[PDB]
C-alpha cells in the first residue's frame, strides 16, 4: 500500500540480509548487501534523518562497500559460485524466507509476537511523535554539535583514525 511503506522497506531490508548472510559469492554477497544498504536508508529517510541516511549511501554503500567488492574482485578463486550452486546457499536463502514469513504472518494476525523482545504488531506510523521543529532540522542540528559539544568524541575518533592509518601500513608493510 503506502502506509506500510516503512514496513515494506523493512521487509526488503530483512530479506536483503538473508542475501549476504547466506554467504554467497563475495561479489554477489556484496550486491545483496548493496540493496540492503539502499533500502535501510529509505527506512531512515522515512523517519527523517536525511544526513544520517545519506551517509549509508555515500560513505558505506558508495564508500566502505566499494573497496569491499573491489577486494573481492582481485582476490577469490577463478570459479565464483552462482547463487544456486551449492545447495546450502539456496537452503540458507529459503531458510531466511521462512523466518520472515512466520513472524510477519504472526505479526499481522495476532499482533502479540513475544520472540525474545515482546513487540506488538501495529503499523509503522503509530510510533511517530508530534510537534513542529521550528526552522532547524533536528538531525542536522544534532551532528553539527561535533564541534560544539562533541569535544571528547572528536579527540578520540580523530586519534584512532590516525592510528588507523598507521596500523594499516604496518600490517601491509610485510616487515
Amino acid at each position: 500500500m503506502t502506509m506500510y511503506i516503512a514496513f515494506i522497506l523493512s521487509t526488503i531490508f530483512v530479506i536483503g540480509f538473508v542475501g549476504f548472510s547466506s554467504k554467497p559469492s563475495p561479489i554477489y554477497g556484496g550486491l545483496g548487501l548493496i540493496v540492503s544498504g539502499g533500502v535501510g536508508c529509505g527506512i531512515v529517510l522515512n523517519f527523517g534523518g536525511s544526513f544520517l541516511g545519506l551517509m549509508v549511501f555515500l560513505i558505506y554503500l558508495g564508500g566502505m562497500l566499494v573497496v569491499f567488492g573491489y577486494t573481492t574482485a582481485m582476490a577469490t578463486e577463478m570459479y565464483p559460485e552462482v547463487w544456486v550452486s551449492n545447495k546450502t546457499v539456496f537452503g540458507a536463502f529459503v531458510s531466511g524466507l521462512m523466518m520472515e514469513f512466520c513472524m510477519v504472518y504472526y505479526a499481522l494476525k495476532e499482533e502479540e509476537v513475544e520472540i525474545i523482545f515482546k513487540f506488538n504488531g501495529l503499523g509503522d506510523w503509530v510510533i511517530y511523535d508530534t510537534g513542529d521543529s521550528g526552522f532547524f532540522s533536528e538531525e542536522a542540528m544534532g551532528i553539527a554539535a561535533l564541534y560544539s559539544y562533541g569535544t571528547w568524541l572528536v579527540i578520540v575518533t580523530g586519534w584512532s583514525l590516525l592510528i588507523g592509518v598507521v596500523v594499516i601500513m604496518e600490517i601491509t608493510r610485510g616487515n
Binding site: 551517509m55 564508500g63 553539527a144 561535533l146 564541534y147 560544539s148 592509518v165 601500513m169
Partner: protein, 88 residues
C-alpha cells in the same frame, strides 16, 4: 513518493530501452584502503556548514581545523613512509 516515482520511472526507462536492445535485434589494495580511511575521516567534517553556525564556534574552530590537520597528518605519515608512492 515523488522521489520514489522519479527513481521508479528512471529504472523502467532504462529497463525498457535495454529490452529493445536485447530482443528486437598490494598496490591495488593500498589505494583502496587509503581511500577508505580518508573517506571515513571525510564524513566527520561533512556536517561542517551547519556546525559553522554554532554559538561556540571558537571551539569549533580549534576542532574543525583539528580533523583537517589530521587529514594532512595521516597523508604526511603515509607519504613519508612510502605510502602514496605505491608499490611498483
Amino acid at each position: 513518493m515523488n522521489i520514489m516515482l522519479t527513481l521508479l520511472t528512471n529504472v523502467t526507462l532504462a529497463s525498457l530501452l535495454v529490452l529493445i536492445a536485447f530482443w528486437l535485434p598490494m598496490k591495488f589494495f593500498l589505494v583502496a584502503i587509503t581511500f577508505l580511511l580518508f573517506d571515513l575521516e571525510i564524513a566527520l567534517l561533512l556536517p561542517l556548514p551547519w556546525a559553522s553556525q554554532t554559538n561556540n564556534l571558537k571551539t569549533m574552530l580549534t576542532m574543525a581545523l583539528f580533523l583537517l590537520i589530521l587529514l594532512a597528518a595521516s597523508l604526511a605519515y603515509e607519504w613519508t613512509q612510502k605510502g602514496l608512492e605505491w608499490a611498483e
